[PDB]
Design a protein around this ligand. Structure first.
Ligand SMILES: CC(F)(F)CNC(=O)N1Cc2nc(N)nc(-c3c(Cl)cc(Cl)cc3OCCn3cccn3)c2C1
Length: 222
């Protein structure tokens, strides 16, 4: 009797300061949590800038898809909010290096700044805005696809470690999906009016199309 699927899953420990930051963010009360969406859309914009720049000199970099955009996908049934871009994406090494194992100077800098009276909303200025996702999410899953490379899934519920594995689900052309599994009391960010007002207020100057796709599994077909 053979398995439908088998795949290797790697578990990595977060660098100590990153673990520290994630604990502070996911546990502490803050009154301006909506800033997470600005930070993720900002990361997507940056990733789109990168692939765009590459395509300036090598058009073939867009063979995996010419459209440069950001999609926002609330799914009330799964209690997930997903931010999708067709930006540059990440290799497996990028995931492991950039999402937890290597310490950035801005990680301790940001926590120092907060203790010195700075606001959480400055997190992006320290290059660690992604982790603001844990203001509203109990678990974050990142699915990513870089040119020439396989599609990978990174995941963490915090608590000191993350996992990486190959993603065999629906193949992306190129880019990154950040899937926020929301905290029970944070479901307001699945509502259309809330998403719209947050994008309007905080992401006004993003130079790529941002599109809402409200997702619902139709009855008996979940
Ligand atoms: C060489 C490379 F092009 F740079 C590899 N490409 C990446 O490293 N990324 C592509 C990407 N796309 C989205 N939508 N988000 C993230 C992102 C995530 Cl998921 C987690 C953290 Cl901690 C930081 C992040 O971006 C920080 C800011 N940045 C955006 C692009 C690059 N740096 C990344 C990282």
């Amino acid at each position: 009797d053979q398995p439908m699927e088998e795949e290797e899953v790697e578990t990595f420990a977060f660098q100590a300061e990153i673990a520290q930051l994630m604990s502070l963010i996911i546990n502490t009360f803050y009154s301006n949590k909506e800033i997470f969406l600005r930070e993720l859309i900002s990361n997507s914009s940056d990733a789109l800038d990168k692939i765009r720049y590459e395509s300036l000199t090598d058009p073939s970099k867009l063979d995996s898809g010419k459209e440069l955009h950001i999609n926002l996908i609330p799914n009330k049934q799964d209690r997930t909010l997903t931010i999708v871009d067709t930006g540059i994406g990440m290799t497996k090494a990028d995931l492991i290096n950039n999402l937890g194992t290597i310490a950035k100077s801005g990680t301790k800098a940001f926590m120092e700044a907060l203790q010195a009276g700075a606001d959480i909303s400055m997190i992006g200025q320290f290059g660690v805005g992604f982790y603001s996702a844990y203001l509203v999410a109990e678990k974050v899953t990142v699915i990513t696809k870089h040119n020439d490379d396989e599609q990978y899934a990174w995941e963490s519920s915090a608590g000191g470690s993350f996992t990486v594995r190959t993603d065999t689900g629906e193949p992306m052309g190129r880019g990154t999906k950040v899937i926020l599994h929301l905290k029970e009391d944070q479901t307001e960010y699945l509502e259309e009016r809330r998403i719209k007002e947050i994008v309007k207020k905080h992401s006004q100057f993003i130079g790529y199309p941002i599109t809402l796709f409200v997702e619902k599994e139709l009855e008996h077909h979940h």
